[PDB]
Write a protein that binds this ligand. Structure first.
Ligand SMILES: *[C@@H]1O[C@H](CO)[C@@H](O)[C@H](O)[C@H]1NC(C)=O
Lengths: 50, 49
């Protein structure tokens, strides 16, 4: 029956960002802008500031 | 539909996992994994197709 047919299971466990990140998504980095109020994205950490 | 009274017995629900290849097992109010840890005054089982 449905409850006894075998399954193949993959568990993907992620470690959150608390260190330098080895695994990252398919995103392209840009240039660095300093001393100006910009929107920043550092390794998935989003924010707005100088 | 047929309603069967279940009382004065010890109910271990893991035996149910050998009784049928279940398609749906969903519960309201009680988590299905703690059912062996509780006590009930009376159980009613309604069976149909
Ligand atoms: C259901 O009953 C039949 C005979 O009454 C028995 O052969 C079968 O093993 C039983 N099914 C389960 C899951 O115990």
């Amino acid at each position: 029956g449905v409850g006894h047919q075998p399954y193949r299971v993959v568990v993907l466990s992620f470690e959150l960002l608390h260190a330098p990140a080895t695994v990252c998504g398919p995103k392209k980095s840009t240039n660095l802008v300093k001393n100006k109020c910009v929107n920043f994205n550092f390794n998935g950490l989003k924010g707005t500031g100088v | 539909w047929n309603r069967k009274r279940i009382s004065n017995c010890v109910a271990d629900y893991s035996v149910l996992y050998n009784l049928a290849p279940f398609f749906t097992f969903k519960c309201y109010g009680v988590s299905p994994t703690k059912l062996n840890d509780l006590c009930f005054t009376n159980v009613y089982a309604d069976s149909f197709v």
